[PDB]
Swiss-Prot record:
Residues 1-39, 40-82, 87-127, 128-170 form the Beta/gamma crystallin 'Greek key' domain. Crystallins are the dominant structural components of the vertebrate eye lens. It comes from the Eukaryota. This is Gamma-crystallin E. It comes from Rattus norvegicus (Rat).
Length: 173
């Protein structure tokens, strides 16, 4: 993977080329108003140590932070997401894997409209990397889900339970 951060919009200003996870990008730039993703799938984080708001980016040009649904020009840590050949997640109605459940291996642009139940409070990521979104059609707050267990919203870094859609992380072409 290769990503380049720019302090000003339109790919201007101080820039930093990156090919690895970073817990602290502050030594290299103080703001990020545009990004070029040469390759790979990336999760950017507003704050150091993979905290704060999260944003999913993949190959392509992002001339303004709004293009990655940024809440501001803050980017202070990043993960390069590794390759997934398969994706599998269990979605549960209540916290701690209780209530109704469905197991999917594809994307879901509208949780509410698609299943046999209407509330979504815990997740077990069996295979692959996913982005969980606050709103339908992959909008709003974004949260990376890695393989493993999410018993309640705090486990995925949300300040509340609001969710709307789910996307597998796969690259483009």
């Amino acid at each position: 993977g290769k990503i380049t951060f720019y302090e000003d919009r339109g790919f201007q200003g101080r820039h930093y080329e990156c090919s690895t996870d970073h817990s602290n990008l502050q030594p290299y730039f103080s703001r990020c108003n545009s990004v070029r993703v040469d390759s790979g799938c990336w999760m950017l984080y507003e704050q150091p140590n993979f905290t704060g708001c999260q944003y999913f980016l993949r190959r392509g040009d992002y001339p303004d932070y709004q293009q990655w649904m940024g809440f501001s020009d803050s980017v202070r840590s990043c993960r390069l997401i590794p390759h997934s050949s398969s994706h599998r997640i269990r979605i549960y109605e209540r916290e701690d894997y209780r209530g109704q459940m469905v197991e999917i291996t594809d994307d879901c642009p509208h949780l509410q409209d698609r299943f046999h139940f209407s509330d979504f409070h815990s997740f077990h990521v069996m295979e692959g990397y996913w982005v969980l979104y606050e709103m339908p059609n992959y909008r709003g707050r974004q949260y990376l889900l890695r393989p493993g267990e999410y018993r309640r919203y705090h486990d995925w870094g949300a300040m509340n339970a609001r969710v709307g859609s789910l996307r597998r992380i796969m690259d483009f072409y």
